[PDB]
Design a protein around this ligand. Structure first.
Ligand code: CA
Ligand code: CA
Ligand code: CA
Lengths: 139, 64
């Protein structure tokens, strides 16, 4: 962690702590998200906080915020998520199959996001994505 | 098979978290209701994207 990183994370913290009270609540979090054009439910906001609220008080103070923003397995879980679609255990997912899953399931990436993903992931350009290589790239 | 949406969302939040580090990634184009995206938008977007990644991480862990 750099001295520059910590100040940048303190600046980011302030954008959420509209209170100035030292903690981010679910309400301040939803306020920021709606300002960006999102409409999260209250349960979605709660799940966001709970993954970060290490003392279980229900809010996020700056050391908790910094802990999460500075954050090990992860690589393996993302591999395991790709392996869900690697039915034959290729180690590979088709660019076509990847675009389909990325665009139409879950968060629904845009086609331009998927373009960027595939251009970076398909190193040899054969239309087949070595997803273990791509997981490495992201981490 | 609830693994499929949870798996997709983990990949997508992870990638979106990675790609927001590139200030000129097309992942910034999704915020259609922001006239001019200033630096304070990007800073909050990066925070939100990290939180969503952690949520997706947990949800995938629970489905597997
Ligand atoms: Ca506050
Ligand atoms: Ca706390
Ligand atoms: Ca390839």
């Amino acid at each position: 962690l750099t001295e520059e990183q910590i100040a940048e994370f303190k600046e980011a913290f302030s954008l959420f702590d509209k209170d100035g009270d030292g903690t981010i609540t679910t309400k301040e979090l939803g306020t920021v998200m709606r300002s960006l054009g999102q409409n999260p439910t209250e349960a979605e906001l709660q799940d966001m906080i709970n993954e970060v609220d290490a003392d279980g008080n229900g809010t996020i103070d700056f050391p908790e915020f910094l802990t999460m923003m500075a954050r090990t397995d992860s690589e393996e879980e993302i591999r395991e998520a790709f392996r869900v679609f690697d039915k034959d255990g290729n180690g590979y997912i088709s660019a076509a199959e990847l675009r389909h899953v990325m665009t139409n399931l879950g968060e629904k990436l845009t086609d331009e996001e998927v373009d960027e993903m595939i251009r970076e992931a398909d190193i040899d350009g054969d239309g087949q994505v070595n997803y273990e290589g791509f997981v490495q790239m992201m981490t | 098979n609830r693994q499929i949406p949870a798996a997709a969302s983990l990949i997508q939040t992870a990638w979106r978290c990675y790609a927001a580090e590139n200030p000129d990634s097309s992942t910034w184009k999704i915020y259609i209701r922001i006239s001019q995206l200033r630096e304070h938008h990007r800073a909050t977007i990066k925070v939100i994207r990290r939180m969503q990644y952690f949520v997706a991480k947990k949800k995938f862990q629970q489905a597997r």
